[PDB]
Scaffold this active site. Structure first.
Site, PDB file in Angstrom:
ATOM      1  CD  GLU A   1      43.798  35.366  36.634  1.00  0.00           C
ATOM      2  OE1 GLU A   1      44.325  35.887  37.637  1.00  0.00           O
ATOM      3  OE2 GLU A   1      42.776  34.634  36.719  1.00  0.00           O
TER       4      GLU A   1
ATOM      5  CG  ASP B   1      37.138  33.755  41.220  1.00  0.00           C
ATOM      6  OD1 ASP B   1      36.542  33.141  42.130  1.00  0.00           O
ATOM      7  OD2 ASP B   1      37.566  34.927  41.386  1.00  0.00           O
TER       8      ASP B   1
END
Ligand SMILES: *C1=C(C(=O)OC)C(C)(C)N(O)C1(C)C
Ligand SMILES: *C1=C(C(=O)OC)C(C)(C)N(O)C1(C)C
Length: 162
Positions: A11, A20
């Site tokens: 991540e 994202d």
């Protein structure tokens, strides 16, 4: 290696609101704020999560705080789900982390829909499960990360993260 180190690799760490891989406002270590296109909506979500007026920037300690809660929430989601809990219970600790990784990325309901892959994991047919898991929007949209998670399911080792 463990689930925290694994997801930190997958991540990243960013201290300002960013978009994202799906285009959704996120912060920290993959903390999804909202799927709304409104940056003010994402900032409101952030302030609610942190408990202060943030204007879209947090500290590393705050990012790690949210991350710990998010890993916990992923586990909680697995254990309450009638589809995921039997599979989780059947797995070794390394493959358990791979399932948590998927739930962290796609949510409890999304992973619980992988009915055929889940059966193959329950059956401990690891190569077959790996082939089935890659036949997915998930793999096609994030193939390098999915390859690492799938290798973890295939082998029961951390080879993809070293
Ligand atoms: C974690 C936190 C932290 O460790 O930062 C110092 C704060 C921001 C105080 N808190 O809201 C959680 C529990 C998210
Ligand atoms: C578990 C939870 C939890 O323990 O988060 C750490 C929340 C997210 C509150 N809840 O929805 C379940 C039951 C999944």
């Amino acid at each position: 290696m463990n689930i925290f180190e694994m997801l930190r690799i997958d991540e990243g760490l960013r201290l300002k609101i960013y978009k994202d891989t799906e285009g959704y406002y996120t912060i920290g270590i993959g903390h999804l704020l909202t799927k709304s296109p409104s940056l003010n909506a994402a900032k409101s979500e952030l302030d609610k999560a942190i408990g202060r007026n943030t204007n879209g920037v947090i500290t590393k300690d705050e990012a790690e705080c949210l991350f710990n809660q998010d890993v916990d929430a992923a586990v909680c989601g697995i254990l309450r789900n009638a589809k995921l809990k039997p599979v989780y219970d059947s797995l070794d600790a390394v493959r358990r982390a791979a399932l948590i990784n998927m739930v962290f990325q796609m949510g409890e309901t999304g992973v619980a829909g992988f009915t055929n892959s889940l059966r193959m994991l329950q059956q401990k047919r690891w190569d077959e499960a790996a082939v089935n898991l890659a036949k997915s929007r998930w793999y096609n949209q994030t193939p390098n990360r999915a390859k690492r998670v799938i290798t973890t399911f295939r082998t029961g080792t951390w080879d993809a993260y070293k």
